[PDB]
């Protein structure tokens, strides 16, 4: 019935030393995975403030099982900053995903938590490479 609804799992992937060294820039990547329906809003937060500069988020989520009709989905985003900005241990980076799922009204008898509308986040702190 409603058991095909799943919230996202979210993870932040830290910039590689190779990129920092070669380009003096640092790209963070956020992945939201395993969600259905494909209705999410992803945003980046740096030191508690939402950022839009240096961000690119996929225009469309991708199906993880493109043959399936109600396949779960994934979405990626990148935030690129200067190498010095990433390497500053005072900078806190957060990828936020708002998921639009079930309400409190909805019945639920599955063993997993009720996939309600919610925000799932992942984080990384800046550091020397």
């Amino acid at each position: 019935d409603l058991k095909n609804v799943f919230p996202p799992e979210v993870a932040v992937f830290e910039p590689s030393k190779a990129e920092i060294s070669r380009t003096q820039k640092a790209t963070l990547v956020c992945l939201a995975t395993g969600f259905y329906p494909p209705h999410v809003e992803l945003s980046w937060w740096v030191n508690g403030k939402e950022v839009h500069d240096g961000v690119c988020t996929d225009p469309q989520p991708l199906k993880e099982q493109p043959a399936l009709n109600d396949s779960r989905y994934a979405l990626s985003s990148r935030l690129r900053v200067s190498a010095t900005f990433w390497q500053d241990p005072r900078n806190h980076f957060r990828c936020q995903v708002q998921f639009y799922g079930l309400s409190e009204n909805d019945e639920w008898t599955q063993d997993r938590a009720k996939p309600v509308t919610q925000i799932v986040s992942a984080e990384a702190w800046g550091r020397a490479d």
Partner: protein, 88 residues
Amino acid sequence: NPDPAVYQLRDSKSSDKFVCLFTDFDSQINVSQSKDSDVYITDKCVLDMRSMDFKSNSAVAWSNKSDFTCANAFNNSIIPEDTFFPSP
């Protein structure tokens, strides 16, 4: 100038998980979709760093398959011969 590279980025909460970031390639490069349904590859995304008047292209690839590496992630695409693949 372009500086095409495929970088490996590690998960901030579990170092054994990673993604592969193909980045800084010129706009004539076509990133192809994956042929294996267990390997995920995003479309090219254009990212603008206004603070530095700088634009760059990227695509992201990941998989749970044990044979997936940053070296083979973008194999389905025609990419530059001078693409940099750092040893991890």
